[PDB]
Amino acid sequence: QCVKLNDGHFMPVLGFGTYAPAEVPKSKALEATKLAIEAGFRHIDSAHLYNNEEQVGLAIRSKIADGSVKREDIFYTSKLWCNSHRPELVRPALERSLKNLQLDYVDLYLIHFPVSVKPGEEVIPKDENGKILFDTVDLCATWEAVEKCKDAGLAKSIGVSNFNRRQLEMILNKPGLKYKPVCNQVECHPYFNQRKLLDFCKSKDIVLVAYSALGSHREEPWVDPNSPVLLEDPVLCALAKKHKRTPALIALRYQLQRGVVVLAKSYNEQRIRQNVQVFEFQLTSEEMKAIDGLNRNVRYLTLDIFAGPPNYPFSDEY
Ligand SMILES: NC(=O)c1ccc[n+]([C@@H]2O[C@H](COP(=O)([O-])OP(=O)(O)OC[C@H]3O[C@@H](n4cnc5c(N)ncnc54)[C@H](OP(=O)(O)O)[C@@H]3O)[C@@H](O)[C@H]2O)c1
Ligand SMILES: CCCc1n[nH]c2c1[C@@H](c1cc(OC)c(O)c([N+](=O)[O-])c1)C(C#N)=C(N)O2
Numbered sequence: 322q323c324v325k326l327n328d329g330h331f332m333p334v335l336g337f338g339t340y341a342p343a344e345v346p347k348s349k350a351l352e353a354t355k356l357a358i359e360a361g362f363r364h365i366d367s368a369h370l371y372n373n374e375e376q377v378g379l380a381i382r383s384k385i386a387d388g389s390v391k392r393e394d395i396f397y398t399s400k401l402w403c404n405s406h407r408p409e410l411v412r413p414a415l416e417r418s419l420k421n422l423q424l425d426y427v428d429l430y431l432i433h434f435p436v437s438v439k440p441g442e443e444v445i446p447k448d449e450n451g452k453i454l455f456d457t458v459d460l461c462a463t464w465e466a467v468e469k470c471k472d473a474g475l476a477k478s479i480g481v482s483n484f485n486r487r488q489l490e491m492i493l494n495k496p497g498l499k500y501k502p503v504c505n506q507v508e509c510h511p512y513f514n515q516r517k518l519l520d521f522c523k524s525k526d527i528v529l530v531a532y533s534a535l536g537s538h539r540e541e542p543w544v545d546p547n548s549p550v551l552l553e554d555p556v557l558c559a560l561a562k563k564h565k566r567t568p569a570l571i572a573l574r575y576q577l578q579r580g581v582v583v584l585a586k587s588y589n590e591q592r593i594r595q596n597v598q599v600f601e602f603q604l605t606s607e608e609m610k611a612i613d614g615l616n617r618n619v620r621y622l623t624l625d626i627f628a629g630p631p632n633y634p635f636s637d638e639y
Pocket of ligand 2: 340368621
């Protein structure tokens with residue numbers, strides 16, 4: 322149920338995603354994470370950006386308190402947001418998360434996104450023309466600060482998210498590198514299966530972690546409502562009928578059998594319990610091939626508002 326990372330730690334291959342649109346009350350993140358743990362999830366993914374780490378920490382700690390799990394049974398991910406890329410601000414950011422969580426460490430700390438924005442409480446700072454106030458930071462300097470967090474034991478493992486191949490290489494080949502990223506958390510699903518980035522990551526011992534595995538939240542305005550609905554896919558639904566599972570479970574199983582760690586968000590009890598069933602069955606080679614055919618090379622999450630700066634990751638082929 323776990324993959325071994327390049328720093329020797331272990332990551333459960335199924336993970337619970339906690340992000341939800343703003344309209345959703347924070348109390349739901351607490352209830353949802355509790356249900357997820359009760360249903361079998363041991364890998365919990367969140368972020369400072371999501372503004373729920375207080376709720377997600379409470380859910381984790383309450384499931385420790387009622388004796389369901391030990392801390393060591395739980396793999397919790399946080400992420401450093403773009404308003405704290407500056408080296409001197411990395412640790413205060415992790416420490417703030419730990420304070421909100423009331424946890425002693427995170428199992429995994431990621432650089433959330435490679436484009437930096439102006440330091441401050443605002444997570445998307447803008448000027449009067451509604452333009453983003455970008456910052457200028459050497460992400461290599463950021464990584465060194467992130468490395469010290471592992472030295473200090475605040476994060477057991479460290480990694481990145483939304484990095485392209487060249488940005489991975491920038492870190493990987495950096496003079497005096499202490500720790501490789503253990504993972505690259507990126508968008509991955511049958512419509513955008515990241516084969517080249519996946520091959521690159523494997524070659525360097527980096528785990529690929531798939532977010533928006535089910536076709537994403539589809540939150541407006543962030544995502545075009547005209548974009549294909551992954552869970553309504555002909556092939557996934559046919560595989561679903563054939564295996565007496567669901568399209569969601571097919572999409573999740575696909576990532577597992579191709580060596581990808583896979584995230585899945587849900588605030589619904591039934592689907593939360595459904596999603597852990599990913600372990601109950603397997604696809605054949607021929608089905609895996611057929612899912613491979615689904616690739617459309619189109620992202621649900623482009624973050625156009627962050628395009629412009631030299632670190633915008635999605636302009637390279639991969
Ligand atoms: N840049 C980043 O690092 C980044 C970006 C995006 C996401 N993420 C992470 O990845 C997580 C998940 O990605 P995501 O939120 O974009 O979406 P997702 O996991 O691909 O899908 C979420 C949507 O699918 C629905 N759903 C869940 N299980 C289902 C099932 N069994 N059958 C049918 N529908 C189902 C959910 O509805 P219900 O809640 O009603 O069940 C929700 O609307 C996030 O929470 C976050 O942790 C990270
Ligand atoms: C910079 C904009 C931040 C932001 N605030 N609210 C958002 C975002 C976008 C986002 C960015 C993420 O990492 C960069 C991320 O981790 C996740 N996630 O977890 O779903 C979502 C987004 C999209 N698409 C949607 N629908 O809502």
